[PDB]
Structure formats: structure tokens, C-alpha cells
């Protein structure tokens, strides 16, 4: 065998713009998540009662996804980018966080997210949101980080959320935040619908900061619980 | 015009693109003509053929398309397709109107930057920026078998028939159908499908050559 | 992979730069029962122009207020009083009185808004706080007639809410476009419209607040 290599081939067009390759090396780690119900007032079939997604946060199957998505379940479905499809069990849930942790039983590898403890967010830091809005198929948004937390009492209730332009909605809790290094940034929130005033917000989403986030699994899987 | 290129910009794609992309008015007779309903199009290659959805011109008593220079023109219908929702124009203009860039060898990739051009509301020529969201997609309506880009470049009724194209301005696709189906009330965000360019440009050829999608 | 010594993309130096200086801007009601709280009439947001204390902001948020409320980022709150409104551009100027020095907007008065150039909108939305929204420029003005009947808005997608108006729209240097005005909600058809929103270029603006400091209004 020729001990000389080959010279390598490349595009011969200019480059675009993109942030794919956070997308190559974040999205396969985020999967869709069913919430399926007996339904007792017919034949107690499973359907879907509600939608999410869901991000894989290491090998061994443990799954974060937002606690409104999953109460109530009888059955919890993972979907991942590839294909696999698997019943999920529930490890735990924490209201004050909204989060709940699932794990999944699988032959092969996983893929996991991306995660640099070390990152701080940054306020107009690029965000891609990856979820499945409207059960249509993982789907992904760009923006920015609006704000990343904040000092006084405001409508959300909260002091440490994420807030983001990119676009957000049904189907999208429980999902990733990337940036675009593909490094997580946090877990997408319930969707913001309506105003107080009544108004349609636009580019007006919300999510659970990572570090955070991954506080909470951990207590979640040792303890089943979080206790303070 | 001694452009500024200073600032992080996409306008470098706008300045090669949007020339070629062209308001579009479906007008019906009432007493007098009167816009019906309203798109965009795409000046495709030299030929001049513009492409634009079917749904846009269908019905239309009078076809008038807006060039971005300022020039009006009737257009005259080449032939359409119902299954791809595509149609192609032909305006009684002299050669050498501004194309849109193509490059066949592209191939799009979720996560591309792209810009839609358009005409929203009759607000005039409108750039938006988004990324490609998501490939090979069924579109709103559950149950059809066409492939679409998904696209949050915001899109709003007038860019039906516009261009969706890259930070180089190449053609990704034919912006066709924003997603409107609410669960309980909740206006959708960010969610918008568009004609890839290749078959876009393989359906504008069939109906150059034979008024008809031959199948 | 290793991502560690990578560099996430970040409009954060534009944020730096602009944002001290985009200002809340509440117009408060008393009516009968609020003399004593701070009930909310009209929200909105300001664009600290000068160390003076001179602020830019839109009439229309400080139209029939009982009092005007300035907030910064850095936590200081003011009362605000009103310099002067002009009608026809929606204008108005406000003046704070400060201790301690004010951050400015940044302004490169040779700088003009192109189409497609990368935009952030800054501004207090729902009252959340603090936001900036990303977009582009989507126009520069309008040539001949037009649904918002005027010629020289600046059009952008950078998604602009309730109590965004007022505040600012700056490029990639953090330098100022233009001030935020109303958005697009609701057409006519009934459909809620997406990514269309409208600001007044920066150099429009500063010509009206100059005229309004030196008289307290546009003397034709």
C-alpha cells in the first residue's frame, strides 16, 4: 500500500454563514419527549396529552425535560434524531425548578450534550433552541441570550433565568439552549403565550440555566428528590 | 455608492438577491381591478422566467409584477403545478433582468444563516434573517409527501413566491407557507417552509419546455 | 471535540457599549387609589443622549403623565421632566438630574443603517427588565406610498414588544441606528404579523432633540 497519501479534496465555493456545527454537535443529544395518557373516558388507549423534548446529559441514559411535560403520564416516550424510540422511566421532579429527570434503557451508545462547566453566558451571546414545536420534527431557532438573570421582583417570578429571542413554542420545553459552539447553555422553558395586557409576545422565551439544571439532576438521581 | 462595509452585515447577500425578487398582485375585476391577494417572485436565470407559488397567481384576472427599480409589468402565465405549489411568469420586459444567484452544487445545511425577501403587507421589499431549521419536511398540512426547508426567517402573508437565500445570496429556496395551526389559542413563532431551489429550478424547466408538469 | 479555547459568536461588546445608557421610562397614574404606589399607565424606554442628563424617548409613552419615572441599569431611578414632544416625528425629550456621571449612547454621526447590516433592540418589553433583541435592518425608508404613510422609518425584524418603544436600535460597534417606535401587531386581515417592527433613524432623532433643548419645541 502506497505509503504517500492522497491529497484531500474541498469545496471549491466560498463558505456560509452557519452555525452548523453546533448543530452537528449538539442536536443528536436532544430528543423529542411524549407524554402519553390512558385515556379512561374511552377505551383507556394511550394517547399524546402533551410534548416536549428533552436532552441527554450523559451516557448512561439520564435525561433532563421540563416537570409540566411529564406530570401526569402513564406512559413517558424518548424519541431520539436517530431513530430509536424508547419508554422512559421517571427518576424524579422538582417544582421550584420545573425540571424532572427520566432514564432510558439502551443497547447502543448515547449520544450525550455538549457541556463547558467552565462557560459563562453572556448577554447577546448567539443561541440556536433545539426542541420539537408542534410535534413536527426537531427543529432549530437562532437568537440571543436577552438576559441572563435579574435583580429585582419582575413577571417571571424568578432572579436566574436565561432569557432569549430565539423563537420558542409549543413543543419546546424541556429542550436545549446552545450556544453556538454547541455548548449547552441551558433548558428551555414553558413557552411566554399571552400578555397580562393581552398582548402576543414575540421573542420573548425563557430558560434554565445550566449549571442549574445540572445541580438539580444530580440531587434527582441520588435522592430521587430534591431536598434543602 | 461607496458602501460601508464596516458594521456585521448581511447586506452583501441583499445587494446580489433582492434586485431579482419581484412583488407580485393577483388583481380580479370588482367595478375595476382590484388586488385579490399578493406574493413575491423570483427572477430565476438570463430566460427572465420568474417563479412563484401557484397559490399567489391562481384565479388571477390580471398579473402585474413590481421590479425593484421601479418598473411595472403585466406578467403572463407559462404553466403551473398543484402538487408543488409552483408556477412560472413571464414578463413582456427586454432582456437582462437581474437574476438570482444560483449554485447547484449547494447543498443547505440546518443551521445556515439565510435571509427571506418578500413583500409583507404590501410594506415593500422586506429582508428578514433567520436559518434553515429544519430539511426535508411535509409542510404545515399533515398528510402531503413534499419536501420543504423549515426556515425562522419571519415570514407573513406577501412572501409567498419570494426568495430564501444564503449570507453568499444563493438561492436556497422558494418561501411557500407559514405554520398557523394553534393548540389552545397560542400564536405559532418562527416557523416557515420554503421550496427547496432544486426542485424549484427542475419543475421551472418542465413547465418552460412543456406548459405542464408531466408525471 | 474540544471546545474550551473556542469563542462562542457574541454581540456582548455592542451590549456593553449601548446598553448602560437604554433607560426604563414609566408613566405613572395616580387616579385615586395609586397615590402611593407606582401604578403603571404607559411603559417604555429612553436612550440617555448626553452627560447632561438628556434623554430621547417617544411622545406617545409620556403622553398624559401624572409623573415620568426614569430607571437605569445600574439601578438609579429619577424623576424625569419633560423637555419638550414633537407631534409630527413622535418624539420627546426628557431631563434628569444626576449626582453622579451618566452613561451615554454611543454615536458615530458618519455611520448609516444599510439593509441586512446585524441589528439589536434595547429595551423593557412587558416590563421584564433590560432586553436586547437580535434582527437586521429590513428596510431604510420607503420611496413612494406605503401602509405605515411615512417615508423614513427604518424597518427591522429584532423582535420589539409592548415597552420596547423609546429605546434603542444599535449595530455590531454598539453605535446607534435609530429609536424604536410602534410595531406592526395586528393587520387588517386579522392575522398577527411577525418580525415587523419600525424605529426613527438616529440622525432624524438627534436633529429634533436638539431643537427641543434649545426651545422646547420645533419652532418651524
Redesign the interface.
Known amino acids: 500500500l502506497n505509503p504517500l497519501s492522497t491529497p484531500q479534496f474541498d ?1 471549491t ?2 463558505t ?8 452537528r ?1 449538539a ?1 443528536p443529544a436532544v430528543v423529542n419527549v411524549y407524554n402519553r395518557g390512558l385515556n379512561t373516558n374511552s377505551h383507556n388507549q394511550l394517547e399524546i396529552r402533551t410534548l416536549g423534548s428533552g436532552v441527554i446529559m450523559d451516557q448512561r441514559g439520564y435525561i433532563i425535560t421540563n416537570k409540566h411535560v411529564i406530570n401526569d403520564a402513564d406512559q413517558i416516550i424518548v424519541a431520539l434524531q436517530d431513530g430509536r424510540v424508547f419508554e422512559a422511566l421517571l427518576v424524579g421532579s422538582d417544582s421550584l425548578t420545573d425540571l424532572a429527570v427520566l432514564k432510558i434503557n439502551a443497547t447502543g451508545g448515547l449520544p450525550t450534550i ?1 457541556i ?1 462547566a ?2 459563562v453566558p ?5 443561541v ?1 433552541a433545539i426542541g420539537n ?2 410535534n ?12 441572563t438573570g ?3 421582583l ?3 417570578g424568578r432572579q436566574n433565568f436565561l ?1 432569549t ?1 430565539a ?4 413543543g419546546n420545553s424541556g429542550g436545549a439552549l446552545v ?5 449547552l447553555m441551558g433548558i428551555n422553558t414553558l ?1 411566554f ?5 393581552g ?6 422565551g425563557f430558560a434554565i440555566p445550566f449549571q442549574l439544571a445540572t445541580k438539580i439532576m444530580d440531587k434527582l438521581i441520588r435522592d430521587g428528590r430534591v431536598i434543602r
Open positions: 469545496s465555493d466560498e456560509p454563514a452557519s452555525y452548523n456545527l453546533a448543530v454537535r442536536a455538549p463547558n467552565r462557560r453572556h448577554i447577546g451571546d448567539v440556536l414545536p408542534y413536527l420534527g426537531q427543529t432549530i431557532t437562532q437568537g440571543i441570550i436577552s438576559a435579574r435583580i429585582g419582575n413577571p417571571t432569557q429571542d423563537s420558542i413554542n409549543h450556544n453556538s459552539l454547541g455548548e413557552s403565550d399571552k400578555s397580562n395586557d398582548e402576543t409576545p414575540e421573542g420573548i
